[PDB]
Structure 1
Amino acid sequence: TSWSDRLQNAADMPANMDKHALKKYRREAYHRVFVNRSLAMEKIKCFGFNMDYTLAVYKSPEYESLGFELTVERLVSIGYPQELLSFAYDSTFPTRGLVFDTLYGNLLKVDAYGNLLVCAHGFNFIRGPETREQYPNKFIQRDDTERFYILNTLFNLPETYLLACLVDFFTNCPRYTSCETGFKDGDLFMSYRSMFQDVRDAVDWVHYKGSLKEKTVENLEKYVVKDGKLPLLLSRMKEVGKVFLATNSDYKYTDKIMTYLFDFPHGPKPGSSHRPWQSYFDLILVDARKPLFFGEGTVLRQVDTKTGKLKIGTYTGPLQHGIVYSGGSSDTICDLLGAKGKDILYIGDHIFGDILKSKKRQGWRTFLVIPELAQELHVWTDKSSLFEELQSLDIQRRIKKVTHDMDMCYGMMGSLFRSGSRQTLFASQVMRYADLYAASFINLLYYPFSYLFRAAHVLMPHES
């Protein structure tokens, strides 16, 4: 049962808001908010939200699998072979945060220094001495952005698997010859770089001009987690501060999804009149273009919410009731809400585009949603004896074995957070940039108005 089954199981539960019951619920790791740096919640004046995979968590593996099908169909329609149509999305293969190496066609799991934790070519896991042929220092240059692509988001799960499927398919299909950097089909050379670009192009097309949005919206219950407790949290937040939405999505899609997310026969709590999703927000901003949004951004536009089209021209007016913005920058939000960065708590799922960039560019407080944490915690817990076993030994053939059995419990590409005793890049970046994090933003409901999340002070080795 997937991480989104855990999420929907907690979603079906009404909030018991008794102060005693709240403190007890957040005992459980799954309902907890984790703290990388202290944050006094009473200093927070604006709560900002992302929509996709934050407010609207798409069900797994159904959504990934829809994405994978439409990308495949798109590749087959631009000329890829019909055999692609036999692929079927497999949730047990990809882990998030993998690096595609476009030179050699390998998916890599790396730590924060670019050290190789896992290397797969197709579905062939390259170990020890064999990786040293292509990675003589067992290390990649992360600044080489033209060669290495980091697959950060849950939207990238379908392509993570599809890249391995393609490399597996071309390797084992006798119509093609394998070379170091790609495949020969007679007088045609298909490099892993141009293959990767085709997949990326196809994924982009499916979101932009394909039928992914259409398919999702015509079966929202199949694809999107809905939670009665969402309006309750938002309404509570609106009593102590301001609430905003900043999404990379367009207004028409945002309105279909948000509408559905609020579609209960009540408002914040049972018995109360239902109210439009828009009333829960002081500022709604679509077509954000994060991370560019946290730099110069783009021109501020105003949505005509009646036609779903943009009005012509740059919006020069004040924040008015019922106005929906498009584009702009993070300075728009600050100026319009009278916030400085440390007043803002921004709640997002995109480690780079939401969390890293708002923290480093603007000094916003950050809350990272990690949907898979629901499952990762259940595995971390019922395999703690294995990690604790791995911990003891470090004072060797045994270390390699335990490490592998540990990781396998998570899937073929192992845990999101570590490979044995080595932390991944993703884990590193969570700790550095996410002040808070949790399986779901909803976990904030279980903490009182002005709670002080504490992390311990950090000492250097000479200071200890």
Structure 2
Amino acid sequence: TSWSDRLQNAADMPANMDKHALKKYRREAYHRVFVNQSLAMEKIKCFGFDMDYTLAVYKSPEYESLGFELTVERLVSIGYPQELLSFAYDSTFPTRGLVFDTLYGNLLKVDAYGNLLVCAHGFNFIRGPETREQYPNKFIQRDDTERFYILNTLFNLPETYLLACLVDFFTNCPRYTSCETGFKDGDLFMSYRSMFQDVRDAVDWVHYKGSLKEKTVENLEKYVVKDGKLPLLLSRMKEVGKVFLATNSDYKYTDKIMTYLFDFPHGPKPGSSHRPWQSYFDLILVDARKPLFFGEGTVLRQVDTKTGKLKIGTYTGPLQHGIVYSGGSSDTICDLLGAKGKDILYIGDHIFGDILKSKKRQGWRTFLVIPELAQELHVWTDKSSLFEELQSLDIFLAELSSIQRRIKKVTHDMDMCYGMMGSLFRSGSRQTLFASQVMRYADLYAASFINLLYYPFSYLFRAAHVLMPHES
């Protein structure tokens, strides 16, 4: 059972909008909205969305596997060895938010302070002492962006696995000599940095010039979660506020995906007339170029929705019914909808590029979708005894060395329940960078934004106050 299997199982259920049923349903962790900062829903006047992995949640592992395959095929087409074609995507390896170290060719899982939690070279998981040779302080300076690339999006899952596959392959292939910073093949030297750039380039190519979009749209049921409750929630949002779409995707792809997401024989509820997807939005903006969108943005353009091409010129006119925008900036949205930042709840999956930037640059309210939570929550509850034992061991150690090997064992067994690179949110008792960023920049979070459907219009989401140590 993948996280998208969980999401789709919940998607298949019709909405029981009885008030007691809703209250009962959102008690469950799976259908809950989690709160890092208090948020009064009555103050929200605009609800905004990203599309990819927010409205359109791609099914796992099928979509990652398609991405992986196409990226492999691209590398082979530019001259990588044929053996790459024997790789096959393995969803049990990558966890989101890993750091690729381009100097030494390692995948690293780090905490909020750059401390190493996990280090793998290819498929070899390096133990603490061997880690010190390359990381003397068990630390990386993560904003050294010339060296470190943080694999923070769900689109980065295939390349996370592919990087490890490639390091493994070159290491074990007798044609190459393993060196500290890459591989020697006679008079050719392939650094991990050059290899990483090739991978990054190929992933970008697959998305923008290759067949990934085409292959997705030709089998949307295979590749995209679909939920008849989506139009119900959007229609309810529109009763109390304005609704907007701001997506990096282009209009043609957006229209294909959104048309699919709304293709039911009814509109908001069973029995109601079907309505086009565009009718659910007060403002539709494509080619957003986030994160730049949250600063200067780009020139505001209008989409010719008949052709899918941009009209020639900058659009200087007002908001009108049926217009579709391209580019612009977050200020376009504010101006056209008559909103200030705190009137907006922006809903997305990209914890850096959208959620962090909308919060930091504009003071928008934020709702982070974390699709993996739909399954991570099942693991968390099913294996609560391991975490609780781990807590009790940390307690017992602190008030006091057979305990230390035991702390490692339980940490390992716990982490392995999630996958080879452990939980998105922690390794044993240590929180990841990703977890820290969620807590810091997402006001609200959940496995799906659909969980908003189970809270009433003016619900007050409450987080407990944070006190300093000297205040406690």
CA deviation digits over 1:380-406, x for unaligned, max 9? 001111000000112911111100000
SS at match of 2:108: strand
Provide the C-alpha distance between the structure 1 equivalents of 2:142 and 2:371, rounded to a whole number of angstroms: 26
Query: How many residues matched?
Result: 464
- Structure 1 residue runs of 4 or more that deviate by more than 3 Å after TM superposition: none
CA deviation digits over 1:125-170, x for unaligned, max 9? 0011000000000000012011000101110000000000000000
Provide the C-alpha distance between the structure 1 equivalents of 2:129 and 2:253, rounded to a whole number of angstroms: 49
Deviates more, 1:390-399 or 1:138-147: 390-399
Provide the C-alpha distance between the structure 2 equivalents of 1:297 and 1:167, rounded to a whole number of angstroms: 38
Provide the C-alpha distance between the structure 2 equivalents of 1:236 and 1:375, rounded to a whole number of angstroms: 27
SS at match of 1:401: helix
SS at match of 1:393: helix
CA deviation digits over 1:26-65, x for unaligned, max 9? 0100000000000000000000000000000000000000
**How far off its partner does 1:74 sit?**
0.2
The answer on 1:412 being equivalent to 2:401 is no
CA deviation digits over 1:345-396, x for unaligned, max 9? 0000000011000000000000000001011110000111100000011291
SS at match of 1:266: coil
The answer on 1:75 being equivalent to 2:75 is yes
Provide the C-alpha distance between the structure 1 equivalents of 2:351 and 2:392, rounded to a whole number of angstroms: 32
Provide the C-alpha distance between the structure 1 equivalents of 2:378 and 2:256, rounded to a whole number of angstroms: 33
Provide the C-alpha distance between the structure 1 equivalents of 2:96 and 2:179, rounded to a whole number of angstroms: 28
Provide the C-alpha distance between the structure 1 equivalents of 2:460 and 2:89, rounded to a whole number of angstroms: 42
**How far off its partner does 1:210 sit?**
0.2
Provide the C-alpha distance between the structure 1 equivalents of 2:415 and 2:235, rounded to a whole number of angstroms: 41
CA deviation digits over 1:395-424, x for unaligned, max 9? 911111100000000000000000000000
Provide the C-alpha distance between the structure 2 equivalents of 1:143 and 1:88, rounded to a whole number of angstroms: 32
- Structure 2 equivalent of residue 310 of structure 1: 310
**How far off its partner does 1:184 sit?**
0.3
CA deviation digits over 1:305-337, x for unaligned, max 9? 000000111100001110000000000000000
The answer on 1:442 being equivalent to 2:460 is no
- Structure 2 equivalent of residue 30 of structure 1: 30
**How far off its partner does 1:96 sit?**
0.2
**How far off its partner does 1:188 sit?**
0.2
- Structure 1 equivalent of residue 146 of structure 2: 146
Provide the C-alpha distance between the structure 2 equivalents of 1:271 and 1:374, rounded to a whole number of angstroms: 30
**How far off its partner does 1:426 sit?**
0.2
The answer on 1:427 being equivalent to 2:411 is no
Provide the C-alpha distance between the structure 1 equivalents of 2:90 and 2:388, rounded to a whole number of angstroms: 30
**How far off its partner does 1:173 sit?**
0.2
Provide the C-alpha distance between the structure 1 equivalents of 2:83 and 2:348, rounded to a whole number of angstroms: 37
Provide the C-alpha distance between the structure 2 equivalents of 1:102 and 1:94, rounded to a whole number of angstroms: 17
**How far off its partner does 1:211 sit?**
0.2
Provide the C-alpha distance between the structure 2 equivalents of 1:49 and 1:398, rounded to a whole number of angstroms: 45
Q: Which runs of 5+ in 2 are unaligned?
A: 395-402
CA deviation digits over 1:58-102, x for unaligned, max 9? 000000000000000000000000000000000000000000000
Percent identity between the aligned chains? 100
Provide the C-alpha distance between the structure 1 equivalents of 2:297 and 2:168, rounded to a whole number of angstroms: 40
Provide the C-alpha distance between the structure 2 equivalents of 1:206 and 1:393, rounded to a whole number of angstroms: 47
**How far off its partner does 1:118 sit?**
0.2
The answer on 1:458 being equivalent to 2:466 is yes
SS at match of 1:207: helix
Provide the C-alpha distance between the structure 2 equivalents of 1:71 and 1:387, rounded to a whole number of angstroms: 37
Equivalences for residues 56-205 of structure 1 within 5 A: 56-205=56-205
Provide the C-alpha distance between the structure 2 equivalents of 1:297 and 1:150, rounded to a whole number of angstroms: 24
Q: Which runs of 5+ in 1 are unaligned?
A: none
- Structure 2 equivalent of residue 396 of structure 1: 404
Provide the C-alpha distance between the structure 2 equivalents of 1:150 and 1:30, rounded to a whole number of angstroms: 28
Provide the C-alpha distance between the structure 2 equivalents of 1:142 and 1:56, rounded to a whole number of angstroms: 30
Provide the C-alpha distance between the structure 1 equivalents of 2:239 and 2:128, rounded to a whole number of angstroms: 56
Provide the C-alpha distance between the structure 2 equivalents of 1:257 and 1:139, rounded to a whole number of angstroms: 42
**How far off its partner does 1:299 sit?**
0.5
Provide the C-alpha distance between the structure 2 equivalents of 1:138 and 1:316, rounded to a whole number of angstroms: 54
TM-score by length of 2: 0.98
**How far off its partner does 1:240 sit?**
0.2
What is the CA RMSD across the aligned residues, in angstroms?
0.6
Provide the C-alpha distance between the structure 2 equivalents of 1:128 and 1:272, rounded to a whole number of angstroms: 60
Provide the C-alpha distance between the structure 2 equivalents of 1:228 and 1:143, rounded to a whole number of angstroms: 42
Provide the C-alpha distance between the structure 2 equivalents of 1:308 and 1:45, rounded to a whole number of angstroms: 30
CA deviation digits over 1:195-215, x for unaligned, max 9? 000000000000100000000
Provide the C-alpha distance between the structure 2 equivalents of 1:183 and 1:117, rounded to a whole number of angstroms: 26
Provide the C-alpha distance between the structure 1 equivalents of 2:271 and 2:308, rounded to a whole number of angstroms: 32
Provide the C-alpha distance between the structure 1 equivalents of 2:155 and 2:35, rounded to a whole number of angstroms: 26
SS at match of 1:367: strand
CA deviation digits over 1:208-247, x for unaligned, max 9? 0000000000000000000000000000000000000000
Provide the C-alpha distance between the structure 2 equivalents of 1:195 and 1:396, rounded to a whole number of angstroms: 38
CA deviation digits over 1:253-282, x for unaligned, max 9? 000000000000000000000000000000
- Structure 1 equivalent of residue 399 of structure 2: none
